[PDB]
Amino acid sequence: LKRGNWGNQIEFVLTSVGYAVGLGNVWRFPYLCYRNGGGAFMFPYFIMLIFCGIPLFFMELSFGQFASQGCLGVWRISPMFKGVGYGMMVVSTYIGIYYNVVICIAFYYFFSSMTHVLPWAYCNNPWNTHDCAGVLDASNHSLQRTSPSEEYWRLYVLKLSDDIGNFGEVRLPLLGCLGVSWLVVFLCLIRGVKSSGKVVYFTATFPYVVLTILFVRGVTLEGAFDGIMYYLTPQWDKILEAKVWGDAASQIFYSLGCAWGGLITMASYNKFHNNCYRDSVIISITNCATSVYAGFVIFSILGFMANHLGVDVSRVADHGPGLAFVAYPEALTLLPISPLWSLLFFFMLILLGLGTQFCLLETLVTAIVDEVGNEWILQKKTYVTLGVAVAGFLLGIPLTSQAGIYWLLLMDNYAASFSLVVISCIMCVAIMYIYGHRNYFQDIQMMLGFPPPLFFQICWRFVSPAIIFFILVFTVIQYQPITYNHYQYPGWAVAIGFLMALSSVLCIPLYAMFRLCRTDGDTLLQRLKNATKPSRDWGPALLEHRTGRYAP
Ligand SMILES: CN1C[C@@H]2[C@H](C1)[C@@H]2CN(Cc1ccc(F)c(Cl)c1)C(=O)c1cn(C)cn1
């Protein structure tokens, strides 16, 4: 009742868009599009969005909107797969631990960019080496190809270590930046005025303005003409191979943030009679448009750098933090007034990270609150938020150590790759195959006011589970040990990452022991029949909305 509602649908749309658009749309998508064929890769991309992304997004949004309960509540349909919700928390923990750290790094790149002359531009500093031949050097990759930005990142932002067990003194600037980031998130998420409602306006709109300013500065007369023909070229003969289709499906699934407790949490707070069908296609379209726009803004300046360096664009191209912190800044430093575009870029990165961390902390907080929901624990939601924030800050300290980025990449690659796919597959199977497709269809028709579109039904029953199984199989078949620029992680890392992935994957089958022998456990067929039929509680979480068929 007093859980609160959005009050304005624009608020929900903006918060959801801010969560959907993450840092992946900045570095992961442009390089993937460049590497995976060429400008034709959009055809495997958007088609997947039509058949994989939008249906799953609609499923999650309708699930949350009708359930009117958090990450754990939505699973009151079958009180056996509730552990899936538990898993949806655990992954939401891991990302929430290693997302802020990235923000932390970006935060350290924000204040350091307020100086008159950029610190990662000139090789006259005392942390340089003999291999600092940079472009702005007026006064062994191939021969000495170590740009000053990479040197600054490797030697001053965090002193990289050789092994993984080498843990030196913690990086004090990174500790301070992580503390500032966590404090900002908590102070915004106080719910004293709103559940980050009227503060998600700026954090969800300003990144678009910054991207627009960057685009106008990057498509002016700079020589960045052969910087878009390498991103908008018709390499049609690279759509036959299954690898590009698998990568497109993976990007569609991971970029949209499906099935880790993000969409469900803020879909729960929605009013019941909300056109969630309109509220899913719109957000998916904005996410894809943002990815496309980022594919232009970065690559324009990358082509400018390629022209100024006398090399082709393929020489300068990175997939993750390499593009964010050492490739893009080394190109931004060459503009006539650099520490304004650099400031805008880092501010936009901070805003994009916050747009997702807000939702992650909301998901964890609302799950914890709704699990033990009484008139006591709803009165002190802010205290729970403070406790979870301090726990996240304390747990994230080792990731700002000398070997922080190794563990960051390990957690990114392992802890939230298999578990997401498995969780989504299990939820998709259970929702319309264990509970029933027709019951869910009439349930959706109850809330939307119209039957679901004739295409979404056949996409839910057939196309979406098949695509999820396909991406699972492609992930299983395509696997290589996680490696840095040049480093092979020993067992101390691969085994640990496997254990972290299992700590979320196995969370589902471990719930099967909570169904004790009291629930008619013997005669296994009867026990399976029970503990999965919806109880007297599942349904709309309000009165005057029973509509006869629910609780006469
Ligand atoms: C594999 N991952 C897991 C997970 C995906 C891809 C989510 C995190 N990532 C990228 C990322 C964050 C920090 C990193 F250090 C690196 Cl390497 C990558 C997002 O972009 C994102 C997506 N949504 C919906 C919100 N954020």
* CB atoms inside a 10 Å sphere around CB 59: 25
How far, in Å, is the centroid of ligand 1 from the Cα of 356? 10
Q: Which residues pair with 413 in a beta bridge?
A: none
**Residue 300 parent element (H or E):** helix 278-309
Integer Cα distance of 361 and 92 in angstroms: 9
Select from 41, 72, 393 the least CA-distant residue to 246. Answer: 41
User: C-alpha angle 295/301/302, rounded to 5°?
Assistant: 75
Integer Cα distance of 112 and 202 in angstroms: 23
How far, in Å, is the centroid of ligand 1 from the Cα of 23? 6
- Counting atoms of ligand 1 from 1, which one is nearest the CA of 321? 17
DSSP at 138? -
* CB atoms inside a 10 Å sphere around CB 233: 13
Tell me, yes or no, whether 64 lies in a domain. Answer: yes
> What are φ and ψ of residue 427, in 5° steps?
-65, -45
357 lines ligand 1 (CB under 6 A): no
CATH code for position 174: 1.20.1740
User: C-alpha angle 37/21/485, rounded to 5°?
Assistant: 55
Q: Which residues pair with 487 in a beta bridge?
A: 484
Tell me, yes or no, whether 485 lies in a domain. Answer: no
301-338: buried (b, 16+ CB within 10 Å) or exposed (e) per residue? bbbbbbbebeeebeebbbbbbbbbbbbbbbbbbbbeeb
Ligand 1 pocket: which of 95, 153, 482 to mutate (most atoms within 8 A of CB): 95
Integer Cα distance of 529 and 387 in angstroms: 40
Residue having the nearest C-alpha atom to atom 2 of ligand 1:
412
Contacts of 375 (CB under 8 A, 6+ apart): none
22 lines ligand 1 (CB under 6 A): yes
Select from 364, 494, 310 the least CA-distant residue to 96. Answer: 364
Select from 94, 91, 88 the least CA-distant residue to 63. Answer: 88
Domain of residue 277: give its range. 9-478+491-529
Tell me, yes or no, whether 2 lies in a domain. Answer: no
Instruction: Tell how far CA 370 is from the center of its chain.
Output: 24
Helix, strand, coil % in the chain, rounded to nearest 5: 65, 0, 35
Q: Do 459 and 59 form a contact (C-beta atoms < 8 A)?
A: no
Residue having the nearest C-alpha atom to atom 5 of ligand 1:
254
Tell me, yes or no, whether 188 lies in a domain. Answer: yes
Integer Cα distance of 307 and 300 in angstroms: 11
How far, in Å, is the centroid of ligand 1 from the Cα of 353? 10
Q: Which residues pair with 488 in a beta bridge?
A: 483
Tell me, yes or no, whether 543 lies in a domain. Answer: no
Owner of token pair 């590009």? 244
Distance set, CA 167 to CA 161, 398, 401, 404 (Å): 8, 9, 6, 9
Owner of token pair 């392992």? 414
- Sign of CA pseudo-dihedral 182, 188, 189, 192: positive
Q: If you write DSSP's letter for every residue of 445-509 in order, what string do you get? A: HHHHSSPPPHHHHHIIIIIHHHHHHHHHHHHHHS----EETTEE--HHHHHHHHHHHHHHHTHHH
* CB atoms inside a 10 Å sphere around CB 44: 20
Q: Do 532 and 80 form a contact (C-beta atoms < 8 A)?
A: yes
Q: Amino acid identity, residue 364? A: L
Q: How many domains does the chain have?
A: 1
Tell me, yes or no, whether 284 lies in a domain. Answer: yes
Integer Cα distance of 329 and 444 in angstroms: 48
Resolution rounded to one decimal, in angstroms? 3.0
Q: If you write DSSP's letter for every residue of 226-256 in order, what string do you get? A: TTTTTTS---GGGSSSHHHHHHHHHHHHHHT
DSSP-derived pairing of the beta strands 487-488 and 483-484: antiparallel
Ligand 1 pocket: which of 23, 28, 351 to mutate (most atoms within 8 A of CB): 23
Strand, coil or helix: what is 56? helix
| Virtual torsion, Cα 235, 238, 244, 245, nearest 10 deg | 100
How far, in Å, is the centroid of ligand 1 from the Cα of 425? 19
How far, in Å, is the centroid of ligand 1 from the Cα of 265? 18
Q: Do 505 and 422 form a contact (C-beta atoms < 8 A)?
A: yes
- Report residue 446 as tokens: 């109850």
Q: Amino acid identity, residue 316? A: V
Tell me, yes or no, whether 214 lies in a domain. Answer: yes
Contacts of 46 (CB under 8 A, 6+ apart): 288
255 lines ligand 1 (CB under 6 A): yes
Q: Amino acid identity, residue 318? A: D
Integer Cα distance of 550 and 62 in angstroms: 18
Residue having the nearest C-alpha atom to atom 11 of ligand 1:
24
Tell me, yes or no, whether 39 lies in a domain. Answer: yes
> What are φ and ψ of residue 483, in 5° steps?
-135, 145
- Report residue 327 as tokens: 């490739």
Integer Cα distance of 329 and 333 in angstroms: 6
How far, in Å, is the centroid of ligand 1 from the Cα of 22? 7
How far, in Å, is the centroid of ligand 1 from the Cα of 173? 23
Select from 66, 71, 105 the least CA-distant residue to 87. Answer: 71
- Counting atoms of ligand 1 from 1, which one is nearest the CA of 417? 1
Residue having the nearest C-alpha atom to atom 16 of ligand 1:
412
Owner of token pair 């942390």? 127
318 lines ligand 1 (CB under 6 A): no
Ligand 1 pocket: which of 15, 99, 100, 253 to mutate (most atoms within 8 A of CB): 99
Q: Do 94 and 413 form a contact (C-beta atoms < 8 A)?
A: no
Select from 298, 213, 331 the least CA-distant residue to 25. Answer: 298
DSSP at 232? S
11 lines ligand 1 (CB under 6 A): no
Report, in angstroms and rounded to the nearest whole number, the Rg of the chain calculated over CA atoms: 24
How far, in Å, is the centroid of ligand 1 from the Cα of 445? 34
